[PDB]
Design a protein around this ligand. Structure first.
Ligand SMILES: *[C@@H]1O[C@H](CO)[C@@H](O[C@@H]2O[C@H](CO)[C@@H](O[C@@H]3O[C@H](CO)[C@@H](O)[C@H](O)[C@@H]3O)[C@H](O)[C@H]2NC(C)=O)[C@H](O)[C@H]1NC(C)=O
Ligand SMILES: *[C@@H]1O[C@H](CO)[C@@H](O[C@@H]2O[C@H](CO)[C@@H](O)[C@H](O)[C@H]2NC(C)=O)[C@H](O)[C@H]1NC(C)=O
Ligand SMILES: *[C@@H]1O[C@H](CO)[C@@H](O[C@@H]2O[C@H](CO)[C@@H](O)[C@H](O)[C@H]2NC(C)=O)[C@H](O)[C@H]1NC(C)=O
Ligand SMILES: *[C@@H]1O[C@H](CO)[C@@H](O[C@@H]2O[C@H](CO)[C@@H](O)[C@H](O)[C@H]2NC(C)=O)[C@H](O)[C@H]1NC(C)=O
Ligand SMILES: *[C@](=O)([N][C]([C]([C])[C][C])C([O])=O)[C]1[C][C][C]N1C(=O)[C]([N])C([C])([C])[C]
Ligand SMILES: *[C@](=O)([N][C]([C]([C])[C][C])C([O])=O)[C]1[C][C][C]N1C(=O)[C]([N])C([C])([C])[C]
Ligand SMILES: *[C@@H]1O[C@H](CO)[C@@H](O)[C@H](O)[C@H]1NC(C)=O
Ligand SMILES: *[C@@H]1O[C@H](CO)[C@@H](O)[C@H](O)[C@H]1NC(C)=O
Ligand SMILES: *[C@@H]1O[C@H](CO)[C@@H](O)[C@H](O)[C@H]1NC(C)=O
Ligand SMILES: *[C@@H]1O[C@H](CO)[C@@H](O)[C@H](O)[C@H]1NC(C)=O
Ligand SMILES: *[C@@H]1O[C@H](CO)[C@@H](O)[C@H](O)[C@H]1NC(C)=O
Ligand SMILES: *[C@@H]1O[C@H](CO)[C@@H](O)[C@H](O)[C@H]1NC(C)=O
Ligand SMILES: *[C@@H]1O[C@H](CO)[C@@H](O)[C@H](O)[C@H]1NC(C)=O
Ligand SMILES: *[C@@H]1O[C@H](CO)[C@@H](O)[C@H](O)[C@H]1NC(C)=O
Lengths: 728, 728
């Protein structure tokens, strides 16, 4: 032991962090690929069998990047030819393989460039999008049936979301919802017709003589937004000589009154669907439980079956209103909302009664509802030890909201404080995912006795390797800002010599409801900066950060770039007091919102930071998309919030950049935070006679994730810092 | 003690070089803008008189950008609202001012956004281009008369060149020619229909919410070219209810067979016009002298009046074929072409015969024909002292080609070695223009006595200032590369100590027919680098450079990126052995071609250069336009030259960049050398795993000439250099 975790170690993932991904297919069975083959595991016994031998894989075209077995287990989809688009969207090619005959369906095949596809909840029907249109195949070998015709590229989307619904509302490309029994197929249609286009250049491969102009309908703050239509389709009459039987469900008057967004779709029963709408302003949402009128095919609404959720201090939900979780019968539902105290907690609702009943209370928050049985509700909260940066699995007894137990809490207190969970079909079993502070740990549990059962993956191999390398230690602690207790974390160099004054790297994000301080174990660039370069890396969650009540999270409502920016400065200032830090060598970096914050900070003139790096930063909110931007800023109009839109640009702080060293980076093909943002920032700094460095990344997106590009930016950033800290 | 020439000195233009711009308006008078007044000087006795006083300009209400007095001196044209387009093109608004009633014309005014305007050669007639169509105004107060109706944006161009003809053929936006007495108005039409569009983003001013996308029909190597047509309009028939009587002159068959370019137009007499065409291949051009047939109104050609010019070792002319200069009768003309030995000299052509007789010869070249009378021919050449980097005015006796005088070689030998001239009508007088080695100096002379009438400007003011400051010296000399002597130049720091060792900076261009080594006086970025930073800045003209005959200039024919690149490396390799050069601190920088050569040099792996800076570099010839590129490289096909097109990209040498500090700089709005070029190059490097520094300049065009931008790039390059050279 005399070697340290290096940039190459981090760049090449020399140290492998293993995990264990399974797929429940029953209340007691899951599918797990091991050594390339799909094995069927029995949760109860641990004994397994073969479902699909590796070798059944005959590199069709390229290779199998994902599979999907149909619910009746008679078939299985093979995803290959993957071709990414946006964060979640992508096209692919599919093969349907008959498990009975263990054959490969060869007639009536799924198209090339398929946008989205999915089995029905039961059986093996198939719905898929292609060229913005919907298709249904009741039988793999049988011919498909075209559902929509309006499908137009960059104009009409049926079955899949457009750019803003993908990135800002559903965090999915998918906009298809099979009914529980497959009778109905729900979908949304998005109309981008009047949505302005962001246009940037994509240079493609060196062989391309002329660059290509990418054009995406992307609504910026205040611009015209796309419109939505919801339809429920009765797949029963789907026949080639029959038309399509579909009903359009509109939002309740209170929202149909103006621009809005469809943000949630939840089937309760085969004849009950739950629509979640929110206004453009996004501080007013509403759940509409619609009932199927057998005698007419209509889907009906009722004032009594509607539930309003609003915010006066900000926006509804974290990034969107929390989803409703209905009881089997569908007469009541449990959903997370804010207290009178402003804490995200579970409230029990009655399908047709407006009053709800919180079943959880506390100065902490429910992160999410994972499972619901006829007796119990399973959820995840950051309650344990009152530290918001941790997560745990809790079970509450429905007949007595006093009987609430914590399953993950004491399993491995030192190694596990951050969990997520996956439950079997009828919540009879569940896998616990431990992500830190110690090495990840995957285990299988039986809901009956919460018995350990077995350890799926302990990363024992990874633990071995790391005992030879000089790893940094990660500590989390609090500090007091204007009365409030806020959390921070510091990755400290090995053999920490307290007499020495270490340089400081503040890694920031600071976006609304963001959380940079947690107990998640990571092998990041910071690890390298501390293990090898003896640089201390810290992060701070202040006003604006989430998982700590609305009072904190909403602090920056309608005023982005203010309190979250300032709290980073005061937090750092406090830190610069600790004896082991060289207050004359403090840098700050961030990506996206972190790049914005970092910029605002450098241009703050606090004289606190010597240099910073902004990767793909927002620079002027009017340049960002309407759904996200407005959710926190409202409209950039003088009758509303124009003033705070203008005094929050980075450009407005240009003059102050003369006091520090700044590295501005940005992918030229960033559909998310358009390259423009940085182009406008640099031009401003140039007008201000301010010197600084830049690094553009040709054809890389918001992720700058291509192999060569990933390695480069981190290598570059690393020298800039060393250069800034006068390091060897 | 003394002061040095500082960066701020160069950027702010603290030391202003003065000059004298006059406009001959007759055989003995010339206009001159003094104190914003327009003075009319009489060259005979030097007495002046006011032509238009600044009073007039105070009264206009807009910043006058320029004016143009009608030949008959009755009207003056005022130009305002100048809006730059490409290197030469631009649009503007125009006022016509009456010089008698000294009243501004306000009836039937000239359109805004006028692309081109010109008075006829006599009288006060006008011709202008608006919306790609031509118009003619006989009188300033009467309505104009539309000539063409085909004007179409980005498609059809009447009276003005397209982008490629503008940048590469005419070095002018203008594409119309009045006959001597204004009888005919000839123009060219360009069809860009099938020319591909280069597209790129222009973010504009910070407040634009969506970047705009600029589309320019621009042909790249091998792509489809614009086509052209030439017409001669008989303006005598112009009249509201009359059609436009015009005639179309097509190139001779030898050029018509395939792709060609109109490259020269020269009126000879009212009835004789000279067109110069050249094949797309550019090693074959022809002059076609057409005569007006009074009986039918057409312009006839004849094989007798055709003159071919071809190059078997490379291309014709320097950046186009030289222009013919006709005698007053048009029965003969004089033009520069390569002689048997490969040196460009003047040949006397018989308008109706094919053989020509050389009136000049030697191992030097005539730069151009300046004036021509029935008795003498005046020209410029680098003959004096046998130094190509020098320019002098010579007069040759038309009746005895052995009798040649050098009118400016001895005037001020030590102070002046680089001259340019400007003769009056009939060449009775001429202003001499000395640009170095000493402070520029403007003088007037008589042609009959060759007496130095008077001094127009000697820059004594500048001289005064430079006295108190420590300027650098510019030594010029020679060396040998493969048995040939090439010239180089060095900008040495003050108190140059042959003893001490200095860091060297190679400033390079090295493009075909270029001359980076001359005796011109320049207050440049290099002046500060030597004066204040004591850095030696050297330039070298090796193979491919011009003004030294075709053997040197055509050496790189069809193989750009080879000898010229190689020669800079050998040259430097020698400079380093000179003892006053510190071989541990050598760098190279260039712009455009220089950026390309610079890049190829660093990619060579010569171990010679430590760091380098490329600005707006070409990186792959298939990315540059057709006219320029094909001229030296041919077509990028395998039946032709694709092989050399491929192994000559900067990307092909990326692997070697791992050994040098590189700085890539480009303006995102560069319409000449597209941003694409540096984007593909940065992409190659990232892939090869090369670290380097970058810098883009938002909305800056090929010259990165906006003010702040200009200051910013030099400031940025200075720190880079100094950082490379270990200079505080
Ligand atoms: C309009 O025209 C009048 C001339 O009739 C201009 O006045 C002249 O302006 C120049 C420039 O300032 C003066 O020259 C100065 O000379 C001194 C000599 O020591 C020199 O030190 C300065 O650097 C400068 O060159 C000139 O004397 C003056 N002559 C007159 C008539 O007073 C006037 O500037 C013009 N106004 C406009 C609209 O520009
Ligand atoms: C998408 O929305 C646009 C409106 O933005 C619809 O366009 C209108 O269509 C109607 C009938 O087709 C016309 O009468 C209007 O003149 C159109 N307005 C505009 C601005 O185009 C379009 O029909 C919608 N598309 C779908 C399939 O819903
Ligand atoms: C935009 O302007 C507002 C007010 O004009 C800024 O808010 C003020 O911030 C100072 C701290 O510097 C406080 O002392 C004031 O009380 C604040 N005023 C209000 C009305 O809250 C805000 O910080 C600016 N935002 C940005 C991005 O600079
Ligand atoms: C492209 O390839 C050609 C041919 O291989 C190169 O030319 C040769 O270069 C070698 C090595 O420098 C010389 O020794 C030969 O004399 C050259 N022969 C020929 C056929 O020219 C050329 O230099 C390459 N060009 C580039 C851009 O690297
Ligand atoms: C930026 O912050 N995006 C970041 C987020 C996702 C890091 C957690 C990134 O790297 O993609 C931008 C600017 C602020 C909003 N933002 C977004 O991309 C948003 N659409 C979210 C919801 C993805 C943050
Ligand atoms: C390059 O040379 N651009 C330079 C030239 C004009 C310096 C003399 C610049 O600063 O504009 C580019 C790339 C090679 C060809 N070139 C051109 O611009 C050419 N069209 C010429 C004919 C202007 C050199
Ligand atoms: C596990 O073993 C039991 C026999 O006790 C069997 O019924 C079951 O199918 C097995 N499960 C698998 C998939 O191995
Ligand atoms: C398939 O699984 C077997 C175990 O049964 C394993 O030995 C073999 O390596 C696997 N083949 C691969 C690598 O696809
Ligand atoms: C559906 O229409 C097609 C039209 O070609 C016809 O051939 C087919 O018989 C129809 N289906 C039935 C049997 O209704
Ligand atoms: C919702 O936000 C908008 C912001 O434009 C505001 O006008 C409206 O009053 C808000 N309503 C509530 C209940 O806060
Ligand atoms: C110069 O003086 C002569 C007098 O011989 C006169 O004819 C001429 O017009 C004058 N020109 C100017 C510029 O005053
Ligand atoms: C321009 O060229 C296109 C084909 O290249 C032709 O069809 C068109 O008619 C031409 N237009 C003119 C005005 O010459
Ligand atoms: C030109 O024609 C118009 C109508 O077409 C008429 O009013 C005018 O008088 C004519 N003028 C001439 C020059 O004949
Ligand atoms: C002119 O160029 C073409 C193609 O580049 C070539 O084939 C032809 O031989 C050249 N002509 C001369 C005089 O060399």
């Amino acid at each position: 032991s005399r070697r340290t975790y290096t940039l190459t170690d981090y760049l090449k993932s020399t140290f492998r962090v293993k995990f264990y991904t399974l797929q429940w297919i029953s209340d007691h069975e899951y599918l797990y690929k091991q050594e390339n083959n799909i094995l069927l595991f029995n949760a109860e016994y641990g004994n397994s069998s073969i479902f699909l031998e590796n070798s059944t894989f005959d590199e069709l075209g390229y290779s199998t990047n994902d599979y999907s077995v149909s619910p009746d287990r008679q078939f299985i989809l093979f995803e290959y030819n993957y071709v990414k688009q946006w964060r979640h969207s992508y096209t692919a090619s599919y093969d349907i393989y008959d498990l009975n005959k263990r054959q490969l369906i060869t007639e009536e095949r799924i198209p090339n460039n398929t946008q989205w596809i999915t089995w029905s909840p039961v059986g093996h029907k198939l719905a898929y999008v292609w060229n913005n249109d919907i298709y249904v195949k009741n039988e793999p070998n049988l011919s498909s049936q075209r559902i929509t015709w309006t499908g137009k590229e960059n104009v009409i989307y049926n079955g899949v979301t457009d750019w803003v619904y993908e990135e800002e509302v559903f965090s999915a490309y998918s906009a298809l919802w099979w009914s529980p029994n497959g009778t109905f197929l729900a979908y949304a249609q998005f109309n981008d017709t009047e949505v302005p286009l962001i246009e940037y250049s994509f240079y493609s491969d060196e062989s391309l003589q002329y660059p290509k102009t990418v054009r995406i309908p992307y609504p910026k703050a205040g611009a015209e937004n796309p419109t939505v239509k919801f339809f429920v389709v009765d797949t029963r009459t789907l026949s080639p000589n029959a038309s399509v039987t579909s009903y359009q469900i509109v939002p309740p008057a209170s929202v149909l009154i103006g621009d809005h967004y469809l943000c949630g779709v939840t089937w309760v029963t085969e004849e009950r669907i739950s629509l979640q709408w929110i206004r453009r302003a996004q501080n007013y949402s509403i759940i509409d439980i619609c009932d199927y009128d057998e005698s007419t095919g209509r889907w009906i609404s009722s004032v009594a079956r509607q539930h309003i959720e609003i915010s006066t201090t900000g926006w509804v939900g974290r990034f969107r209103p929390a989803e409703p979780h209905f009881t089997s019968d569908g007469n009541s539902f449990y959903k997370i909302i804010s207290n009178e105290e402003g804490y995200k907690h579970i409230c029990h609702f009655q399908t047709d009664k407006s009053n709800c009943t919180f079943i959880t209370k506390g100065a902490w928050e429910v992160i999410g509802i994972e499972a619901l049985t006829s007796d119990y509700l399973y959820y995840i909260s950051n309650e344990h030890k009152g530290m918001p940066g941790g997560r745990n699995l809790y079970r509450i007894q429905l007949n007595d909201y006093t009987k609430v137990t914590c399953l993950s809490c004491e399993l491995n207190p030192e190694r596990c404080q951050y969990y997520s969970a996956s439950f079997s079909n009828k919540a009879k079993y569940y896998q616990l995912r431990c992500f830190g502070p110690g090495l990840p740990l995957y285990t299988l549990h039986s809901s009956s006795s919460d018995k350990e059962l077995r350890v799926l993956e302990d990363n024992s191999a990874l633990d071995k390797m790391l005992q030879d390398v000089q790893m940094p230690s990660k500590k989390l602690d609090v500090i007091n800002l204007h009365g409030t207790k806020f959390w921070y974390q510091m990755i400290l160099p090995p053999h920490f010599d307290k007499s020495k004054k270490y340089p400081l790297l503040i890694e920031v994000y600071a976006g609304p409801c963001s959380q940079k301080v947690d107990t998640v174990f990571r092998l990041s660039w910071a690890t390298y900066l501390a293990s090898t370069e003896n640089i201390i890396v810290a992060s701070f969650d202040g006003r604006g950060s989430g998982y700590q009540g609305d009072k904190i999270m909403h602090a920056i409502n309608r005023r982005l770039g203010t309190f979250e920016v300032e709290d980073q400065i005061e937090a750092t200032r406090q830190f610069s007091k600790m004896g082991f830090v060289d207050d004359k060598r403090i840098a700050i970096w961030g990506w996206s919102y972190g790049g914005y914050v970092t910029s605002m900070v450098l241009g703050a003139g606090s004289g606190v930071f010597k240099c910073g790096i902004a990767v793909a930063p927002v620079s002027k909110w009017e340049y960002y998309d309407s759904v996200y931007t407005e959710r926190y800023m409202g409209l950039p109009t003088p009758e509303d919030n124009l003033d705070y839109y203008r005094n929050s640009t980075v450009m407005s702080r240009a003059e102050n950049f003369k006091q520090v060293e700044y590295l501005l980076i940005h992918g030229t093909a960033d559909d998310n935070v358009h390259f423009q943002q940085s182009a406008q920032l640099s031009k401003a700094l140039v007008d201000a006679g301010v010197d600084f460095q830049t690094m553009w990344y040709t054809d890389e997106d918001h992720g700058i994730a291509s192999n060569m590009a990933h390695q480069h930016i981190y290598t570059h950033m690393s020298h800039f810092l060393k250069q800034c800290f006068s390091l060897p």
